A paper describes a structure:
Rab7A (Ras-related protein Rab-7a), a member of the Rab family of small GTPases, has been demonstrated to be a crucial regulator of mammalian autophagic and endosomal pathways. During mammalian autophagy, Rab7A can facilitate the maturation of autophagosomes and their fusion with lysosomes through its interactions with relevant regulatory proteins and binding partners. Particularly, the GDP (guanosine-5'-diphosphate) -bound inactive Rab7A is reported to be recruited to autophagosomes by its GEF (guanine nucleotide exchange factor) protein, the MON1/CCZ1/C18orf8 complex, which can specifically convert Rab7A to its GTP (guanosine-5'-triphosphate)-bound active state.
Then, based on previous structural studies of the fly Mon1/Ccz1/Bulli complex together with our relevant sequence alignment and Co-IP results, we used the truncated MON1A (235–652) fragment for assembling the MON1A/CCZ1/C18orf8 complex, and subsequently determined the Cryo-EM structure of the MON1A (235–652)/CCZ1 (1–482)/C18orf8 (1–657)/Rab7A (1–181) T22N complex to a 3.41 Å resolution, revealing a unique architecture of the MON1A/CCZ1/C18orf8 complex bound with one Rab7A (1–181) T22N. Meanwhile, Rab7A adopts a typical Rab GTPase fold, and packs against a solvent-exposed surface co-assembled by the two LD1 domains of MON1A and CCZ1 to form a triangular-like architecture. Specifically, the hydrophobic side chain groups of Y37, I41 from the Switch I of Rab7A, and F45, W62 from the Interswitch as well as L73 from the Switch II of Rab7A occupy the hydrophobic groove formed by the V281, V283, A284, L285, and F288 residues from the MON1A LD1 domain and the L64, A67, and F71 residues from the CCZ1 LD1 domain. In parallel, the positively charged K31 and R69 from Rab7A couple with the negatively charged E238 from MON1A LD1 and E41 from CCZ1 LD1 to form two pairs of salt bridges, respectively.
Residue numbers in the entry:
A (entry chain B): 17 to 482
B (entry chain A): 236 to 652
C (entry chain C): 1 to 657
D (entry chain D): 8 to 185
Amino acid sequence: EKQFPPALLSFFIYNPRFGPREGQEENKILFYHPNEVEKNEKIRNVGLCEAIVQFTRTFSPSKPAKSLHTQKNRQFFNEPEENFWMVMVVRNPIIEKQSKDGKPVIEYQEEELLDKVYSSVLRQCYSMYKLFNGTFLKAMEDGGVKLLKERLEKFFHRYLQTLHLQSCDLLDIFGGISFFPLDKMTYLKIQSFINRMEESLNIVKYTAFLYNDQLIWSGLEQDDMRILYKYLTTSLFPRHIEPELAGRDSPIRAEMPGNLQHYGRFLTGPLNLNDPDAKCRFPKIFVNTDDTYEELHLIVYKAMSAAVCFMIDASVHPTLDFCRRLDSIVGPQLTVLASDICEQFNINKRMSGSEKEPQFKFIYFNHMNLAEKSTVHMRKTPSVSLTSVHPDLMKILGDINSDFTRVDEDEEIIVKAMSDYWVVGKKSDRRELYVILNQKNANLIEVNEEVKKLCATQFNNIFFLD
Amino acid sequence: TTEGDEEDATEAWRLHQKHVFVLSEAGKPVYSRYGSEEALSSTMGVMVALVSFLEADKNAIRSIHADGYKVVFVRRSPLVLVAVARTRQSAQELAQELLYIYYQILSLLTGAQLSHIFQQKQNYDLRRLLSGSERITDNLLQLMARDPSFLMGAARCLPLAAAVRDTVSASLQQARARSLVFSILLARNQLVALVRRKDQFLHPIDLHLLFNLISSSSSFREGEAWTPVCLPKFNAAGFFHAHISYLEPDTDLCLLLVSTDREDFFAVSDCRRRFQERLRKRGAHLALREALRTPYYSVAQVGIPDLRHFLYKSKSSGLFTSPEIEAPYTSEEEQERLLGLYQYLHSRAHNASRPLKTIYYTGPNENLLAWVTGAFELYMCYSPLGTKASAVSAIHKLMRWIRKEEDRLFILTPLTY
Amino acid sequence: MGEEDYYLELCERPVQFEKANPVNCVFFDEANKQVFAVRSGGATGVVVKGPDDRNPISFRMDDKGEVKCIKFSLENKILAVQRTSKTVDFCNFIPDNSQLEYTQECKTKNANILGFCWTSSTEIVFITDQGIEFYQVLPEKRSLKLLKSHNLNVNWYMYCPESAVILLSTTVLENVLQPFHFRAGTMSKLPKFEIELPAAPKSTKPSLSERDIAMATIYGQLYVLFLRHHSRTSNSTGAEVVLYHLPREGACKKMHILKLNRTGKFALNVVDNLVVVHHQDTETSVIFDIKLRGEFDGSVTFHHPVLPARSIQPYQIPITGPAAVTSQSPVPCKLYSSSWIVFQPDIIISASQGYLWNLQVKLEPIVNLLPDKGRLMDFLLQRKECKMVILSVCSQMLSESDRASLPVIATVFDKLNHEYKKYLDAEQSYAMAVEAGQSRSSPLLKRPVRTQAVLDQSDVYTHVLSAFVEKKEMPHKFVIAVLMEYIRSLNQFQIAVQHYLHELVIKTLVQHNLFYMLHQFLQYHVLSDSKPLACLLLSLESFYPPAHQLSLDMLKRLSTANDEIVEVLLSKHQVLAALRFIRGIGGHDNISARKFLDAAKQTEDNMLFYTIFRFFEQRNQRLRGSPNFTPGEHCEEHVAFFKQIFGDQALMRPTTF
Amino acid sequence: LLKVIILGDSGVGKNSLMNQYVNKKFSNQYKATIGADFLTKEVMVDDRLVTMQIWDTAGQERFQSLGVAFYRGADCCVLVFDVTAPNTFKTLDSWRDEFLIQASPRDPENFPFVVLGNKIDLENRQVATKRAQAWCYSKNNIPYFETSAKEAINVEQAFQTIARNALKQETEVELYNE
């Protein structure tokens, strides 16, 4: 038996104004992955997506198409900037089953994908590109279609190698910032330290403060912090924490001369402060791309577990003297603070005794501070987490989420699957809470009671219904 | 004529909620539901290309989704059907609605006669073969939007007296002619009794097409008009024949005698009176008329506070019951809105991959429960101020009122010729 | 040098009296701090001037010989005069009354009175070269009943009134010290101790004069100061002043040392718990603090001078006398004159001019001569009257001219809140022991006095942070940093954060359009819950939209603000949600049929509103008794929606039992 | 109604060549002259109203395989070739070939075509009109018309003969299929 999971069939970006006249149709395509496809096939897929948009603009001239479904692919569109359409073509699952005549046959499981997961992934692609490389039209006014195409290729040709659509789920519909639980005292200490640092480093312009890969503080705005958080916890922290799991024989840790009086150690830019000609290659992000359009060097300094993200303005080039001074200043302070928060978190974990695994496996998301919590997803690998419950229940949660959004009010949907698994979901006060209860032989009232009990244990200070 | 009128028209032609078009595999408009058949070629020219575009590269267009309104494509050998809904209906349900429209076009003229007239010339205009008979296919959507038998795929039997049903069904059972297959006695979209040829089986899609046939035109009320009809789900090959005695000139109680040959008008039309006479002399005709005086039973009879409507279907037999939808859902719009909710629960509890057996939805409007088990599918609809305890209590109270009053509101014994 | 250069000033209203001339003998009583000027010549006309005394005590006595010493008892009731070598006279002093001198001679015949000490209002000690004799005065009887005594060889004596201790130098080298205390008219023995001597030359034997010892009351404790001059050698570390701690119980222990880095003559004083030393050779004054962190060599604590040596502020004596009509300039008294004599505490007398001064410490000038705000605060948290100057520092620490680094502000606030926390703990313990049933006559239950150092949030809100925030000169990031720094110090010393501080943080966070900062401070519970804060957030609904929701859940976390939640939900038109909420707590029987469906036609699904009227009696009809509402809540008037009515509802079956 | 497919050639205002006759921007782009343009008009032909549904087929070899389907049930195929170009005349006997192989109507030898020579206003004509006329005569009398899509002359009569001959053909279709 074979269960072919979904997989990125294609991805492209076009603009239906470029090459307005025939003989110039190839000028519509600004990017196409994979690039080895016959040119006529490129223009056929682009023509089909543009035709579908032009079609569903006959019935609602303001709301163009958002996804097209077929037998072997679902194609999700997106218009992030005026007339710059992106399209992602995913492949439906396949059940390949051996027949008794000796010929195994393929059945395209047409109705197994969720529109929301992959539309979110597509908008996430655009927003990550926006963070790391500007916008689409600013790049145009800067350097023409040639520069636009070059930037698009150089970013996406590498980015799309880390879209693992085989494991996309609800937590991608969410796209949230898993916060760290802290009390008044430690959080105010963190504010004191951040103000100290930013004032003793007068060129530092913005700041973020992560702990254990879970955000704590964020100087940036809200729309520009979720992308940067996804980048920090997907592509920055795992690669630079892996050497501590791969051992002394790593080709990067060997060139990492640490400091003895403080555990401070960089993660971007000059990673080894002793080589006197170390280069200051800091990643360079774009924030507030709507109003002020700032370009900032990103300096991730990581103590034991905590991690400050300083954002220096564009022109102010940090010299290696600046990096040595910054380490000398921040290392001891950040080591003290990281030890403080680690001790506090350990003591708070011990204070909550080892009660049996909470029989409600939930998922929580807060549409305003983008907090997000889950005990159905286990961190098997820190880059992307893998769930801990049946895939059937995950698709059930997907269907529930898809049934919610139709009106933005206080709703709740309880369900019992034929495995007798109870699945609850509430949407209220701009929050969504999905719960799974493996309670066999239950009834609706006991299940409502159980959701009440979990809500009182964890979200008591979080508005909800009884 | 200035373009101002055309502008006002097409600006108000797109807010309609259930645009349905059906066209031929060439690109010639067969049927257009809310628009003129002339303009909505050019548009709907697009509609065949998009299908024949994705058909080139070993694929098929299956649906388009904006945010707010789906657009569903369905293909059958001689016709493609496209439905631009604006509702909360998953792609599958709209596909079922289009398949009903297609099985309807199959009922107007046989389905082995479409393959033939389109394998002979793909140029064949089909809007001048099934011309005039649009309101047979234009109301079927309205029945699809108000009557809940479609979403449930079962016939709603009339709540007749326990014994009177046996008498009327016996009067039916006696008049068995050789050129007969089914004898159906329906009363205004409800199934009083039915007697099929022995060891035969009817399909609810066919019953609903006959319901639409009768409820569509008014001619059926004057006298016995002997008409042909093919029931596509039973035998797609050839025609059947049936005629329509609206028994009492004031009320509406038609019996159906579907037959196997075309010129048996008299051999089976005798069965009309050979049936009516014994029933009328039994006096059971008076009890039938009296039950017909009020065929809809409200929900207050159940004696349940916080309960606005319900549907109940018995998997054992295959029929269902439902009160009159009356209290807030009276406006012909709220009727579809409520109807769409049971559509949601029925699709959500019958997803062959992931099946459920208890739902509950506590919204900013009617909040509903949907129980399902081996024997029966029970769907309800409350008032939003209903605690879960109150709903789980009403779901046993109503079930008791059903199991107690069952034999009155159902058809318990299948009658065979 | 301007006024911003000196810190030791003199009294604005000094005591001017008749100067010292061979006819008018002048003496001083440190116990009562009264100067006697007696014009002899038979009719000894004595005038008495004190610091508090409004009208100088003027009177006449007879010249019964040369007057040697004169002192009044406590409350100034009894006068005692030593005029002879063995016999001291006394007078029950009633003003405007003739008093008979009664004479008492010492018990030991060959004992010579050095003087006397009015230990209390009715008891007195006589120090003779051969011992001490403690009597009590019987003025109406005009006799002295000898209470106690002790015969001992003596070089000289010294008396401290506030601690009421006599000290006697007995050994010929005067380096052995016999102290004696007095309490409740009872004499008590204090243990003897010894003074180490510095290196002496072979030209004489160094005699420890009366002028080398002093007694002081520093931080409530009794200290013995000895002025030890380092004889001139190549290793001359300058002269010093050693503070032997003399406890009321236990051995007198050398505890503190004071380095002068000078050689010559010195005049000591104690002003506002500081030890002031004047070097007369170069007219310099140095202040020592004993509670400032000093060099602890493991045995004793050494202290540098707190500030750089300066001269006492040049003083301007106000003109007095009948010649004051002419425009004469003020006379500046001769600072550091050789006629300046010192008495503990803080009393300097000038016979050359006949003036009396109580040296004082100004605190504004130390805002400049000491920049280390850490030590500066360690210094201003001990002196009295330190609230105006501490607030001036705290507000100057934030002006753009002298804007201080942030750890400096953190340390300053930590010290202020340490004082505040001490006061709060003392007050809580007092109130708890008061409710615990302990009486006021208990020596442990005294209400803790709130000193001038304690700066509660009211002060740091009125004098520091309000103007600082409203000045709009500082970079707003600095302003919010200072605010959250104050709040951090507070929450660290486990103090309650007054809600108005949170209102200030919100005012500032919104005024500079920092909104996600407000969201984070709300999410992590830095701006704690309240009804007024919820009102403020809800008011902010226009600028930053989620604030509305940020308010709502706040109200929910209150659990004491139900009706507020209900009115805000009615405002947001979530009628169904308000209803499903009030039915949750339990008030669904007490609610009014009016509001929920009189605010009905504003959402127009009237069964979205009339589900409820019958429901309104589906709960409690048994209490009243009617299908439609009666005037129970004036609802009998409020039947006005059944006009366009759809369907058949029309009444509740009024269940009555 | 008449499903008329208008074979053209890319290069001559393929995106503005047909828009004179239908007099309205119904057809814009929906896989249109990148796929095939869809545009209609009512004609009064022998006092009968005919509904011409017009599919301009893009000649791009990248967009050609959609020709097998777009040619189903054709009532008239109209060939547009340039009088100023000899190459699209040489191709005129290869125009009909692919159309007859893919559309494959029942009776191809008499299936109605119409040849249209556009851009007559432009000077320096390379194809003598008589050349195309002789092609038509040797091709079983396919009606031909010279027209100017920038002048809108005589194209109405081209659609006129389209609709008349194809009305004969459609009466024949209904007669055979019954």
